[model samples]
Target: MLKRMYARVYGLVQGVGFRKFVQIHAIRLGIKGYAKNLPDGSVEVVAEGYEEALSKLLERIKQGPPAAEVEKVDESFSEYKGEFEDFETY
Candidate 1:
């Protein structure tokens, strides 16, 4: 099923290749969206894809990169919008 997931990952997420990790997984899962660094020491990831892919993405977000200390992940789901053709990091 197609859906959308938005999440803000907290704690040691910046400067740890977090966005790249997300991008890689998003592409691997064929998810379309982007991951960006927030101004408040957090990383924001928005993805649209199959339910299973989103679940895996969410899990990865919580786990984060090896150097990332993932403290928490605030996530929500909403209707999917075909707004992107590929996943990106910024």
Candidate 2:
């Protein structure tokens, strides 16, 4: 099941190594996408891969890293775009 999952992770996300955590998990799941810090003090993750992998990572994103206080995650689904070959952070 290939798909794209766009997520907006809110609450104490930015300065908490959340992007690195997402990158690591994305790579581990063999997903390709990007995680970026937003000015609104949240982290946005765009990833495309197996449904199982995405589901697994969604849990992590909801919890965030140890230092983060994840308030909520806004997740939307879409078709794969073949837009990335590897995961990245910015």
Candidate 3:
């Protein structure tokens, strides 16, 4: 089944190639969504895809990119929107 997830990541996420990392992972997982750097010194992500893929993606997000110092990852499940054409950085 498909699932939609919203994630708010905090810590040293910006200026660390986090968005690009997310793009690469999303494409690899064939997931569709958007990830962006929030003005509040965090990152926000909205993604929709197969449950298994989403799970793996979350795991990757938790670990973060090599230079990212992830302090917290807040995530929640939502009704799949099926709106995105492809993964993006915004």
Candidate 4:
């Protein structure tokens, strides 16, 4: 089944290539959405894809890039919008 997830990842997420990493993984998983740096030292992401793929993506977020030290991740599931055709950083 298709699913959409909105997440706010905190701690060492910015200035560490988190958004680019998300873009790469999202494209590889055929997921689509946006990831961006938040003003409050967090990264916000919205992703839509298959349930299994989304699960994997969430795992990846937990284990971020080598330079990232993800301290926390808040997520919420939502109805799929199919609004994005590609992943991007905003």
Question: What's the TM-score of every candidate structure?
Answer: 0.97, 0.97, 0.98, 0.96
Candidate 2 local lDDT, 1-90, one digit each (tens) = 999999999898888889999999889988999999998888899999989999998998998889999999999989988889989999
Compared to the true structure, candidate 3 yields what TM-score?
Answer: 0.98
Q: In model 2, where do residues sit more than 4 Å from their true spots? A: none
Off by over 4 Å in 3: none
Q: Looking at model 2, which ten-residue stretch has the lowest summed lDDT?
A: 8-17
Clashes (N, CA, C under 3 Å) per candidate: 0, 0, 0, 0
lDDT of 3 by residue, 1-90 (tens): 899999999999999999999989999998999999888999999999999999999998998999999999999998998999999998
What C-alpha lDDT, on a 0 to 100 scale, does residue 28 get in candidate 2?
90
- Candidate 1's error at 72, in angstroms? 0.4
**Candidate 1 lDDT by residue in tens digits, 17-37:** 899999999999999999999
Clashing pairs in 2: none
